[PDB]
Amino acid sequence: GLDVAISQNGFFRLVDSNGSVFYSRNGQFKLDENRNLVNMQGMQLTGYPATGTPPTIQQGANPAPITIPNTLMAAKSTTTASMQINLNSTDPVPSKTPFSVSDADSYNKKGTVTVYDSQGNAHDMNVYFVKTKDNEWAVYTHDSSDPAATAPTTASTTLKFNENGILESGGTVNITTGTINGATAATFSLSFLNSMQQNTGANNIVATNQNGYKPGDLVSYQINNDGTVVGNYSNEQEQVLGQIVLANFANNEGLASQGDNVWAATQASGVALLGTAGSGNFGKLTNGALEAS
């Protein structure tokens, strides 16, 4: 149950299920099963639709019933990941060759980051650091979640650090996972940004991140003071969903009272002239609203 009633001039513009157009300052709306915002008589709040990708509101649009769909969204294949590591400059070059994910004395450090494909399967990506010489570390990757994946014999990248132990090159590399249960692989940029070689310490992963997940669930929606309606999502992104329209008449005294504080245009009132809060004829909404899902 939303509440955006208007103490100002301007009317909301509503339609009944036959398309007849009505006007009211009452701002009490419920989201019904048809995914419209309706008043207590079931009339549908109208406004400009959103189009495109990303969706936006155009100046050329016909008002239509607001929808808040309600259709789901898909899963989220990982396209970025990061691993911040502190590497020890005094570490030995492993004597055991070759590098093997199974031989624990053939590498200097192992870390993990779990990424997702478009189906939402988890791939546990193992990352191995092998000091090759002073200030250089080869990096191998392997999808431990895919039994058909070939064992890594060639490095995905090589980290080179300068004399001060700051990462100088090799810090960004595209990785493609294996496949799980017939689903397509994830392809993501792996970043070692902020990794450093310490003069002395123990090899240690300080942070990992990645941007994929499971078809999940999100958060809130809001009406801004210019009537724009925005959804807020659990991926820390937002989407514009529509923009409420206001109406004004040359002669408000001419409007036909429909009961409650709802009104219909007549020959006496003139046609509704439409716009938005905060522009032209209309001042901003007094505040707006914010609601959790």
d(Cα 22, Cα 46) in Å, to the nearest integer?
Answer: 10
How many structural domains are present in the chain? 2
Selection from 178, 183, 141 nearest residue 158 by Cα: 141
CATH of the domain at 93: 2.60.98.20
Asked if residue 277 and residue 160 are part of one domain, the reply reads no
The tokens of 10 are what?
A: 């301007």
- 201-230 burial, b for 16+ CB within 10 Å, e for fewer? eebebeebebbbbeeeeeeebebbeebbbb
Asked if residue 240 and residue 261 are part of one domain, the reply reads yes
- Where among 190, 214, 238 does a domain terminate? 214
Selection from 208, 73, 172, 183 nearest residue 122 by Cα: 183
d(Cα 55, Cα 240) in Å, to the nearest integer?
Answer: 7
Asked if residue 221 and residue 207 are part of one domain, the reply reads no
Asked if residue 59 and residue 125 are part of one domain, the reply reads no
Experimental technique used? cryo-EM
Asked if residue 205 and residue 119 are part of one domain, the reply reads yes
Asked if residue 205 and residue 79 are part of one domain, the reply reads yes
Task: Please check whether residue 75 is in contact with residue 186, taking contact to mean a CB–CB distance below 8 angstroms.
Answer: no
Asked if residue 257 and residue 268 are part of one domain, the reply reads yes
Residue 38 is part of which domain span? 1-74+215-293
Asked if residue 203 and residue 100 are part of one domain, the reply reads yes
**This structure's resolution (angstroms)?**
9.0
DSSP string of 225-287, one letter each residue: TT-EEEEE-TTS-EEEEEEE-EEE-S-GGGSEE-STTEEE--TTT---EEE-TTBTTBPPPSS
Task: Please check whether residue 168 is in contact with residue 158, taking contact to mean a CB–CB distance below 8 angstroms.
Answer: no
The residue whose two tokens read 């409007």 is: 255
- Where among 199, 214, 229 does a domain terminate? 214
Selection from 23, 42, 20 nearest residue 31 by Cα: 42
Asked if residue 180 and residue 121 are part of one domain, the reply reads yes
Selection from 90, 44, 87, 89 nearest residue 63 by Cα: 44
Asked if residue 90 and residue 210 are part of one domain, the reply reads yes
- Where among 214, 245, 262 does a domain terminate? 214
Asked if residue 183 and residue 130 are part of one domain, the reply reads yes
Coil, strand or helix at 23 = strand
Task: Please check whether residue 101 is in contact with residue 151, taking contact to mean a CB–CB distance below 8 angstroms.
Answer: yes
Asked if residue 274 and residue 253 are part of one domain, the reply reads yes
